[PDB]
Structures are given as C-alpha cells and as structure tokens.
Subunit: 200 residues, 3 copies
C-alpha cells in the first residue's frame, strides 16, 4: 500500500470558528483550528493550531469561578460522526484511497479506564506529556504561558471504544474567560507524535 | 532500498518484566517496556513506554539513601548481544530485509568521552534534552512528575563503541524505591527523535 | 515525485565556525553548527547542533550589559542567498532532483507582522514552543540550562517574504559572553518539526 498518508482539516486563516472546546468551569466555546496529520508507516504525527476570539467564542459567564477559569480541553478525532467532541470538520486525505481511520492513534498503553463521551462534558487529563508554549495574544487577553498536556485517551460511546488525541491547554493567568476582557489568542503549531493504530 | 524501516519490541500489555533499570543508589530492578521505532530515510523516531511494579521489580533495599532514590536510567539499544544494559528483547523488524543496525542512533556530536558499559552500572546523564511527563500510578506510589533526560550516549565495551539512547527518569518525590510502599508506575509514550546512523 | 527529501549542512566536527549568531546586546559572533533536515511528504523535521567557542567566536565587548547577556538567536534558512542571517552553508540535498526550497517551513499561522531582515540585527521571538536542554560546556563557561524558543518566523527582505526557523537560546546564567571567561558550549541535537511549505 501507500507508506504515507496525510490529512488536513480546519480553517487555514483561523477565521472560521466551527470547532468546540470546553473549559474547566464546564463552559463550552466555539474555536478555530488548523489540523495537519501524517501517518508515516504507522507513526502518527499531528500539527495543530488553535484560536479563541472574544467576539466569536460565545457567551462567557460571569461568576468568579467561570471568569477565573484557566484550562480548556480540545479533542482531535479520526471519528467525525461517532466520537467527535470538539467538532473536527471533514477535510482532505491524501492519497485518494486513504481514509480517516488511517489517523486513529494506537491505544495509550498507560490508560485503561475510558472517558464517558459527552458533547459538552469537560475532561481534564492529569497524565501524560507536558509542553509549554508562549501564545500570540491581542487586546486585553493576557493568559501568559500556555502549558499543554497532550496524550491519546480512550473514550467510550455507545459500547464502542475510540482513542482520541486530547489537549489540555493551561493558561498561567486568568484572563481569557473573563467577559470584561476582549481579545484573541492563537497557539501553535503544537506538534505531537505517537504510534498510529494501523499502517496506511 | 526501503526508505522506511520499523522495529517493535517488548511487552504490549506491560505485564512482562524482562528488562532492567538501575537507580541512583545503584540498585537494579526488573521493568516492563514497549518500544516502537522508525528509521525514516535516516531519521530515527523512538516511542517508549516504561513500567515498574513493586511486586515484580525485585528487592528494594531499605537504608535511607536507597529508599529516598528518585532517578533511574533506562537504555534503548540496537546491539542486543554486544551492548544491551537494559535487556531490550528480540523483536520484529519490517521489512524482512531490515536489521537492528538500521535503528542505531547517529553519534551524539556534543559528547566524546564514552560510558564504560556495566550490566548493573548506574549512568546518570547530565546533558541533553529534558521532557516532563505526569505518570500513571497505582497504590501507594506517589513519585509526582517524572522529568526525563534523553539523548544518544557513546558507550564503550571491549574496545568497541556503540551509541545507545539513554533515558534518565527523575521522580519529583521519593516514593517508588521505598520498600514500605506498594504500587505501580507507567510512563509514556515517550517520543524521541534523532538522526539515525544509517539509511535503512 | 520523491515522497522524502533530505538536506545536510555544516560542520560534522563542529570545528568549522562559518555561521553567525547575534546576542541580546546586539553583538555578533561566529559559531559552528550541524543541520540535518527531512521533508517527509510535507512534514519538515529539523535536527540542529550549535557550538560557541571563546577562541573562535570573536570579540566579546566588556561593558556590564554586554558581559551579562544570556540570549542569542540562530536562524535556519532555506534561502541561502536571499535571506540567510545566520549564514547557513551550502550542503547536500538528496535525492539529486530536490532543491533547498523543499526545506522551507510553511508560514506560521500564529504570526502576521514579519521581522525586517538585517545581517547583524538581533531578533528576539517571545512566542512559540519552549524546549529545555542541558549544554555540554568546557572551561570557565557555566551558562547552566539552555531554554530554547523555536518557531517558523516570517521575515521581510526587499519586498519578498520568507519563513525561516528561528531559535532563541536562553542561558540560565550570564557567563559565556563575559570576555574574562574562556570556554566552549555545545547544544543538541535540537529537534523541531513543523509543516513544510511544499511536498518534495
């Protein structure tokens, strides 16, 4: 077969806000992303950009707890109909014979108990690799450094198990979820490699 | 030739404890691992899981020094007979014409003086890249975050030089080497890329 | 076409000091490097070693500000004539039909305003991924840990835009730019992956 498959999805301009992220106060928001993936003979390499904008993200509750939220979770999925909590969009696979199941991560060998899938449930991974990024911010958003916990996570839905890539983005400062602050934030490219579930 | 070679070794369940790790108090232990490697046109990509279990690791000396140990070293080798201090097991290479020498890292250009190979010697690398992981832990094991120093290291044995991949796993808290504490710990997948010594 | 292209440049021994780095006090220095790159079906993987040596780097101003400098910037470019602030040398591309434009990074989706290219200008990136290395040091050089900010950066020159890979190396301690201290420092291999601008 083909030794290498690729997948590209999302908004190249980061100006289309068609995905979803849930923060630690269980508030759901619209976000933009750009996703580029490779399956290189069973190695899954994933590049991701994420953007939030006060003007497109949605209502930000006031209440101290909500306004002081710092963490939010984003999910990259290869199961766009069956287990897609962050609403990854249909994209382009190369070559033409590849399919999105070429982009499922191999199960995480450190984790057994799965997350029960919700459309708006907040999942906070406390295990796995930790990366640090400085974000690109505009306006009155001042999150500071963004820590990123990233790992393959087993997710249960309707008696089926899926492994998804989970990103917990962890602001240094409360800022971006406070409705009194307008602004934007972009982080990336966040790179993550792991074994793929199959060969392309 | 083939542009891409792969190697897989170890325990998929992490329930077979056939490798070896030495900690900073020079105490040797049995551990489980799962190793997946790629040589992509001379780029070596390595994925590793590691597991320790109080019930299989071996005797844990008491003595303050031993019980308060936090660091341990694991070695990934492509020289399973000649220079294999952590006891990587025979595995599966793809394609059929590839050999394990396809998985030797290129020499580290920052290091000249080699480590003198021992079957039970403790080597503590103080140079190189540093990654941080949160482990998956059970029972009364509470190591906290695991720092990971990882790099290709030159190793001497019987007038021959080998480059191996060295991992120093560095617990935040003394816990796992204290014989009064039962538990387990899994870390991974730890990803590391470096130039390969050759093309596959 | 070829799914995989490679590029190799610089000094394998790190003993040829033909590249350039500018530090935070705007002092320019000669340095050695070794650069190995892959374009794997549009994924750009870059391995870099960097070396400074008091005996080859050039004049180190005294003046408190200069001597206490800790950060310096290195640029990897695929535009060796048009936009090459660190003086990457001509190298070897494989296969024979590949060219250096196969190694241009895709534009950074988080950054719009470019850096105005200088031959000796200091650029300090404050956004992007952050890695940590322990360096290999000799003599009276004691920089401690080296933080590394690394990202693709848009650069303007003569009405043309280029994306280059920018590395900000950030010493923990003032040491290496103090003319009273002789020594050397090597860091690497620093690995960085990002999307490539094109397929090879």
């Amino acid at each position: 077969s083909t030794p290498i498959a690729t997948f590209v999805s999302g908004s190249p301009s980061l100006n289309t806000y068609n995905a979803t992220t849930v923060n630690s106060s269980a508030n759901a928001f619209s976000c933009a992303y750009y996703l580029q993936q490779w399956n290189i003979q069973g190695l899954l390499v994933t590049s991701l950009y994420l953007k939030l904008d006060s003007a497109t993200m949605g209502n930000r509750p006031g209440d101290l707890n909500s306004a002081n939220a710092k963490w939010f979770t984003f999910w990259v999925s290869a199961y766009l109909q069956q287990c897609n909590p962050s609403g990854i969009q249909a994209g382009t696979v190369s070559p033409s014979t590849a399919t999105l199941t070429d982009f499922e991560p191999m199960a995480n060998r450190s984790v057994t108990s799965p997350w029960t899938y919700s459309a708006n449930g907040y999942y906070e991974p406390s295990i796995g690799e930790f990366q640090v990024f400085s974000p690109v911010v505009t306006g009155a958003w001042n999150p500071g450094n963004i820590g990123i916990r990233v790992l393959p996570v087993p997710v249960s839905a309707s008696g089926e198990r899926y492994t998804l890539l989970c990103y917990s983005l962890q602001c240094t400062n409360a800022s971006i979820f406070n409705p009194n602050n307008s602004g934007t934030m972009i982080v990336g490219p966040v790179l993550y490699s792991c074994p793929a579930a199959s060969l392309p």
